[PDB]
Design a protein around this ligand. Structure first.
Ligand code: A1EJX
Length: 272
C-alpha cells in the first residue's frame, strides 16, 4: 500500500517498509486533539525537522461519497490559498483509505485559550482577534468562498497576539452544504439562504462569547434572543460602546442589511 498525493490541480520513507508514510516521515511529538473527525498530532518531520500539525481521519473510506466529502477539505484549503490569517496547507496525501492533512503548526485554538483564562478576554486581545479573523473572512469572501464554521474552536492563535482562521472542512464556493454548528448559525441559514453574510454573523457570536464568557444556546428560547437584533442585556454591559456597536452591526438579523467584512474593516475602530 502506497501513499498517494491529494491536490486539486519523502527521504525518510522506504516504500519497502510496512510502516505508513506518516510513521516513516514524521516524529510524533504530541496528540493535539481527537474526535470523530480523527486525530491531530503535533509532529516534526523526519525530512526537514520543522514543526507541523497533521490531521488523520478516523476510519477508512466508507465509499466514494465519503471519500469525496473528506478530500473536499483539501480543495477548500487550495481555493483559500496563501494568507497570513489563514492556516496554510503544506501537503495532503491518502494511504490505506485514511486522509492526511499537514498544515503549519499554530498555537492553541481560541477555545483552548479562553478555557485557560476562564474569564472574559480583555478587549485589547478581542479587537486583535476580531481584526485578524475579519481579514481572513474578507479574503475568503472576495473569492466567493463561505467558511460556514467560524467559531472559537476553528480559530488558532499565532505569535505576538495574532490568530489565524482554520478548519475549512465545511467551506463552500458560491456558484453541497453540510450541517454547521447551530450555536453560531446565522438565522437566514435556517431558511436555506446561504451567502457570505453568514460568516459575519458567526464571528459576531464568536466575539460575543469570548468577550463575555457566556455559553451560546444550542436552540430554544435563548437561541431566538441572540437573533432579534438586540445584544443580551446582562452580558453586553462590560463591553465598550464601540464594541457593542460593531457587534450589533455583525448580529443584524437580515443578511441583506448585515455589514460585510470589508465594510467592517473599513470602520474607524478597526484601524491598523
Ligand atoms: C479537547 N480538544 C482535543 C480540543 O479542544 C482540540 C481539538 C483540536 C485541536 C486542533 C485541531 N487542529 C489543529 C491544526 C490543524 C490540523 C490540520 C488541519 F487540516 C487544519 N486545518 N485548520 C487547522 C488545522 C493545527 N494546524 C494546529 O496548529 N492545531 C490544531 C489543534 C485543538 C484542540
Amino acid at each position: 500500500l502506497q501513499p498517494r498525493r491529494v491536490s486539486f490541480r519523502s527521504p525518510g520513507y522506504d516504500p519497502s517498509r510496512p510502516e505508513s508514510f506518516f510513521q516513516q516521515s514524521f516524529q510524533r511529538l504530541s496528540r493535539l486533539g481527537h474526535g470523530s473527525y480523527g486525530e491531530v498530532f503535533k509532529v516534526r518531520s523526519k525530512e526537514d525537522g520543522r514543526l507541523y500539525a497533521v490531521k488523520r481521519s478516523m476510519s477508512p473510506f466508507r465509499g466514494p461519497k465519503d471519500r469525496a466529502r473528506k478530500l473536499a477539505e483539501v480543495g477548500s484549503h487550495e481555493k483559500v490559498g496563501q494568507h497570513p490569517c489563514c492556516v496554510r496547507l503544506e501537503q495532503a496525501w491518502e494511504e490505506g483509505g485514511i486522509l492526511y492533512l499537514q498544515t503549519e503548526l499554530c498555537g492553541p485554538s481560541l477555545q483552548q485559550h479562553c478555557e485557560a483564562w476562564g474569564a472574559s478576554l480583555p478587549e485589547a486581545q478581542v479587537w486583535g482577534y476580531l481584526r485578524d479573523t475579519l481579514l481572513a473572512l474578507a479574503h475568503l469572501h472576495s473569492q466567493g468562498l463561505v467558511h460556514l464554521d467560524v467559531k472559537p474552536a476553528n480559530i488558532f492563535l499565532g505569535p505576538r497576539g495574532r490568530c489565524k482562521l482554520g478548519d475549512f472542512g465545511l467551506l463552500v464556493e458560491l456558484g453541497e452544504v453540510q450541517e454547521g454548528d447551530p450555536r453560531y448559525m446565522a438565522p437566514e441559514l435556517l431558511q436555506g439562504s446561504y451567502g457570505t453574510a453568514a460568516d459575519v454573523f458567526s464571528l459576531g457570536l464568536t466575539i460575543l462569547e469570548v468577550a463575555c464568557n457566556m455559553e451560546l444556546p444550542h436552540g430554544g428560547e435563548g437561541w431566538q434572543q441572540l437573533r432579534q437584533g438586540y445584544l443580551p442585556p446582562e452580558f453586553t454591559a462590560g463591553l465598550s460602546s464601540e464594541l457593542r456597536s460593531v457587534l450589533v452591526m455583525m448580529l443584524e438579523p437580515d443578511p441583506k442589511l448585515r455589514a460585510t467584512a470589508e465594510a467592517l474593516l473599513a470602520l474607524p475602530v478597526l484601524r491598523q
